[PDB]
Scaffold this active site. Structure first.
Site, PDB file in Angstrom:
ATOM      1  CG  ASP A 442      38.458  -7.982  47.759  1.00 20.31           C
ATOM      2  OD1 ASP A 442      38.240  -7.003  47.019  1.00 20.31           O
ATOM      3  OD2 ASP A 442      39.489  -8.845  47.879  1.00 20.31           O
ATOM      4  CD  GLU A 476      28.911   5.293  45.561  1.00 18.77           C
ATOM      5  OE1 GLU A 476      29.928   6.169  45.047  1.00 18.77           O
ATOM      6  OE2 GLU A 476      29.449   4.111  46.582  1.00 18.77           O
ATOM      7  CG  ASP A 510      42.074  -4.852  49.023  1.00 17.06           C
ATOM      8  OD1 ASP A 510      43.108  -4.363  49.022  1.00 17.06           O
ATOM      9  OD2 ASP A 510      41.847  -5.635  47.878  1.00 17.06           O
ATOM     10  CG  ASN A 616      42.300  -9.275  49.677  1.00 16.63           C
ATOM     11  OD1 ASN A 616      41.277  -8.510  49.580  1.00 16.63           O
ATOM     12  ND2 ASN A 616      43.493  -8.870  49.806  1.00 16.63           N
TER      13      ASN A 616
END
EC number: 3.1.24.-
Length: 631
Positions: A442, A476, A510, A616
């Site tokens: 996640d 990133e 996810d 999650n």
RNA sequence: UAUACAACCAUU
């Protein structure tokens, strides 16, 4: 079997047209052009341009050709897939807006002709709504059209007799919490409070809970039951303007839907029903169930004393029969030699417990049965301040007062679930999958921050590792470093548990991988792996019953619809990469089985694969997830 | 919070 997918039949190319206006600033020229065409124009330092599908597109105003520039560009979908999809999304929005649909975030399009006031509440409008998404299946482009409903106030917020907690803006399509509407000034939440200049652009949006709250959920349920199928059937006529890009009369229609049979293995039997765990006992237990009690006051204790006696003074109550049925060696309520009691107080105001010798010396697995006076809106302090040597097991006082057996049974099941030496069940089809490391990811980016959480489990549902990082700087390169670090940690946990590397590693994400995929691809390794994108919010559905079915879209994309007593919702699974010895079909089956390798209670099942469910949940709160996830 | 359920989610 029907799917709500519609084939897009347009040239796979994007056209970019240019315009120049000397009398106007390019940003303003582009803004006015966007407003009148319901289609965003972009601007440069001097030129304004628009990217459109290669179809007939009449720009407004008519005389805008007086600003048209010679320059034109054609971009094939080959050269830029995202540009084609972005352009098609904007083109669909324009058509809906051109037919006076309201736009709502998530590509929901609210009809303004297919509206009826609710019989139950005169001040509520039921707007027929269509949510539209674009899908790339088998090298072709499709359009999912999900009929649904939006319930809005008939009058603007300030002129609406009924009210709710959320306002929907007609222009932007965004929703904001409703702070106040008094003396003609409407205030919304942006944590910034703002007075609005056109409060008439705001309508109240009514959810499933508001309909229950304001007493019209019965009609809301009726409409959803046998009036959404008419929405699937009204698509060709109501959405006729979409004939430009698709044939609404050519529906999406032997072996592309397989039913997956999930059998649970208990100690003394097997079943497809998790609740048969009480018939055949935990697959592995023989452990003691030890517990102590925490009450918010002496008064609360006396309020529930009769039920406490019925449950725990009768050594053959439903509580003790549940523990015996689940395979606990014994039930033991530890008592402090000082107070000679197994019952203690906690401060319900601060959610604190006084540290004592007895509490501090508690070792091993001991459940803290903590009686809550009411549902707590912010339970983080209770988890945060509770002694860490106790397994926090809260329960509502009202549910101890009335003693519904399935609730007490579930409560004891959860306790067993939270004892690591126990195993309620193993999946028959997962028994030979120990060689695999199942990891859920996640990771979200919002501000300029990044939020990450990972969770790894084995074939039995044991949680190997959970990692969480809060408020990382959006970058990133930095974010993928931490990803690798947490991944290596989970990897080591598997080795730490199994003394061998995992032969295969399942990385379930996810959503879609938006990070540098090649960087990920390399460090995931000499280990074989698969990269999986999971979309719990897929728009592909049907009026047919697809619950517990796995549907194949193309070679690398599947959808499963998990068992649910609510509305039929799908979960998309896309094999981005695969170098394991498993076929796609086998990987898809293992991902579905992961939704059942654990249960919170035997009476409901998870919708997402357990590692993703954990990721999650742990990412959602600072401490509350400790009440649900045994880690 | 026994479960479950929570507003949306490529203009001002």
């Amino acid at each position: 079997a029907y799917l709500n997918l519609y084939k897009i039949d347009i040239p796979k190319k994007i056209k970019r047209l240019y315009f120049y206006n000397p009398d106007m600033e390019p940003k303003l020229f582009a803004r006015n052009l966007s407003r009148v065409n319901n289609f965003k124009f972009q601007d440069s330092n001097d030129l304004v341009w628009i990217e459109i599908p290669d179809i007939d597109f009449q720009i407004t105003p008519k005389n805008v050709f007086q600003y048209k520039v010679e320059k034109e560009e054609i971009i094939k979908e080959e050269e830029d897939k995202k540009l084609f999809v972005k352009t098609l999304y904007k083109y669909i929005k324009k058509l809906f807006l051109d037919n006076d649909f309201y736009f709502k975030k998530g590509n929901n399009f609210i009809s303004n002709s297919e509206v009826f006031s609710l019989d139950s509440n005169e001040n509520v409008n039921a707007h027929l709504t269509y949510k539209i998404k674009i899908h790339n299946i088998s090298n072709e482009y499709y359009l999912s059209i999900l009929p649904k409903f939006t319930f809005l106030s008939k009058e603007p917020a300030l002129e609406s007799a009924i009210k709710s907690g959320y306002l929907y803006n007609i222009k932007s399509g965004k929703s904001f919490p409703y702070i106040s509407g008094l003396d003609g000034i409407l205030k919304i939440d942006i944590n910034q409070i703002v007075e609005v200049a056109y409060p008439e652009n705001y309508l109240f949006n009514f959810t499933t809970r508001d309909a229950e709250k304001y007493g019209f959920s019965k009609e809301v349920h009726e409409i959803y039951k046998n009036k959404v199928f008419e929405g699937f059937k009204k698509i060709p006529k109501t959405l006729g303007f979409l004939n430009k890009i698709t044939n609404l009369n050519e529906n999406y229609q032997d072996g592309y839907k397989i039913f997956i049979n999930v059998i649970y293995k208990f100690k003394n039997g097997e079943s497809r029903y998790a609740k048969d765990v009480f018939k055949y006992s935990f697959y592995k237990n023989e452990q003691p169930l030890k517990a102590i009690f925490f009450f918010s006051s002496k008064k609360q204790f006396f309020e529930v004393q009769k039920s406490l006696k019925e449950l725990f003074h009768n050594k053959h109550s439903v509580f003790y029969r549940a523990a015996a049925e689940l395979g606990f060696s014994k039930v033991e309520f530890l008592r402090d030699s000082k107070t000679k009691s197994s019952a203690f107080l906690y401060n319900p105001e601060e959610f604190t417990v006084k540290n004592t010798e007895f509490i501090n010396q508690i070792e091993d697995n001991v459940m803290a049965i903590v009686l809550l006076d009411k549902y707590i809106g912010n339970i983080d302090p209770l988890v945060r301040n509770f002694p860490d040597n106790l397994i926090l097991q809260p329960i509502l006082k009202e549910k101890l007062e009335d003693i519904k057996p399935f609730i007490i049974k579930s409560y004891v099941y959860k306790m067993g679930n939270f004892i690591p030496e126990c195993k309620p069940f193993i999946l028959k089809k997962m028994e030979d999958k120990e060689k695999n490391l199942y990891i859920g990811i996640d990771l979200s980016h919002d501000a300029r921050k990044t939020n990450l959480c990972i969770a790894a489990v084995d074939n039995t549902g044991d949680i190997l590792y959970i990692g969480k990082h809060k408020n990382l700087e959006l970058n990133e390169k930095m974010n993928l470093d931490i990803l690798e670090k947490e991944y290596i940690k989970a990897f080591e946990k598997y080795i730490e548990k199994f003394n061998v590397s995992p032969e295969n590693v399942f990385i379930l994400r996810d959503g879609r991988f938006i990070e540098d995929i090649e960087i990920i691809k390399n460090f995931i390794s000499d280990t074989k792996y698969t990269l999986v994108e999971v979309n719990k919010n897929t728009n592909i559905n049907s009026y047919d019953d697809l619950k517990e079915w796995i549907i194949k879209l193309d070679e690398n994309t599947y959808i499963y619809y998990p068992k649910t007593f609510l509305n039929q919702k799908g979960v998309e699974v896309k094999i981005l990469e695969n170098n394991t010895d498993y076929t796609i079909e086998e990987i898809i089956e293992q991902i579905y089985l992961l939704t059942r390798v654990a249960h919170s209670t035997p009476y409901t099942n998870y919708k997402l694969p357990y590692p993703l469910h954990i990721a999650n949940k742990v990412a959602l709160t600072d401490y509350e997830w400790k009440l649900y996830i045994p880690y």
